[PDB]
Amino acid sequence: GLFGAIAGFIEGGWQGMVDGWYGYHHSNEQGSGYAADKESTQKAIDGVTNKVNSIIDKMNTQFEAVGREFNNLERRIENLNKKMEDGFLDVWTYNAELLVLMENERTLDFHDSNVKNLYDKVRLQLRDNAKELGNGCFEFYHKCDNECMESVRNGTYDYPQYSEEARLKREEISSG
Amino acid sequence: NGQSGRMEFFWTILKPNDAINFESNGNFIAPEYAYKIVKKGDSTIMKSELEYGNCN
Numbered sequence: 001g002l003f004g005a006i007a008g009f010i011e012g013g014w015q016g017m018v019d020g021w022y023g024y025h026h027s028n029e030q031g032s033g034y035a036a037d038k039e040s041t042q043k044a045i046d047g048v049t050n051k052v053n054s055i056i057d058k059m060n061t062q063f064e065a066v067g068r069e070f071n072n073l074e075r076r077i078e079n080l081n082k083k084m085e086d087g088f089l090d091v092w093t094y095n096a097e098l099l100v101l102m103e104n105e106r107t108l109d110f111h112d113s114n115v116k117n118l119y120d121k122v123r124l125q126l127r128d129n130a131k132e133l134g135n136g137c138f139e140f141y142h143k144c145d146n147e148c149m150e151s152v153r154n155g156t157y158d159y160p161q162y163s164e165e166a167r168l169k170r171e172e173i174s175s176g
Numbered sequence: 177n178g179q180s181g182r183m184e185f186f187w188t189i190l191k192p193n194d195a196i197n198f199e200s201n202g203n204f205i206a207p208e209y210a211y212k213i214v215k216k217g218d219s220t221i222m223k224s225e226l227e228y229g230n231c232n
């Protein structure tokens with residue numbers, strides 16, 4: 001997809017993530033588990049809901065064919081009537097099929113964008129307090145218990161709190 | 177239908193308080209019944225070979 005996340009650097013989706021479209025899986029001394037990102041999920045639902053409504057609203061006034069009859073010496077106007085009615089039905093068939101293919105392309109890229117932005121939201125909070133593994137996961141250089149994990153998921157991660165613990169660990173590793 | 181003669185029919189809408197006057201010395205197919213328009217609204221003449229389906 002355009003944003004490189006879904007079936008991209010994140011190899012596949014999670015059957016285990018049932019309560020959000022995008023979210024997290026963590027593992028620490030306390031255990032492991034899934035959690036939805038409810039904010040990005042809700043934003044995306046709102047966008048798709050509006051999209052569906054927009055598409056239907058804009059098609060709300062389109063052409064309505066009406067039966068009209070003509071006698072055997074009104075063939076020219078009969079033919080003009082047929083072409084006119086068919087002409088609008090072709091315009092509107094095109095408008096609907098095309099709009100649906102275009103918006104479908106945009107919806108699937110919108111999801112990819114949302115996953116990418118969630119990953120970056122975590123990446124830019126953690127900075128060098130964790131290692132990027134390249135597969136959508138981060139390995140922390142400090143212990144990160146459940147309240148700490150929740151601070152990452154809710155955008156309140158406190159980098160200064162853990163920066164010295166992480167520095168010591170980064171140095172241990174880099175010193176070999 | 178067995179006949180070489182032809183009947184040609186005509187119609188008009190006669191507005192309230194107007195009158196229609198006929199005069200003829202032959203070949204006249206005269207009105208007996210006419211149709212008062214008592215309800216106007218959306219309708220259509222739909223071309224179909226189907227008949228009533230007893231549904232709504």
Ligand SMILES: *[C@@H]1O[C@H](CO)[C@@H](O[C@@H]2O[C@H](CO)[C@@H](O)[C@H](O)[C@H]2NC(C)=O)[C@H](O)[C@H]1NC(C)=O
Pocket residue numbers: 193194195
């Ligand atoms: C059809 O009949 C009505 C009578 O019921 C005629 O209207 C009247 O015309 C007279 C004038 O001769 C007036 O005094 C009445 O007030 C009218 N009545 C109404 C209800 O308008 C009407 O002229 C007749 N139509 C024609 C074309 O002869």
Ligand SMILES: *[C@@H]1O[C@H](CO)[C@@H](O)[C@H](O)[C@H]1NC(C)=O
Pocket residue numbers: 147148150151154156
């Ligand atoms: C975010 O998570 C932390 C858990 O460590 C919690 O203390 C805080 O109340 C949460 N804040 C918001 C804004 O939800």
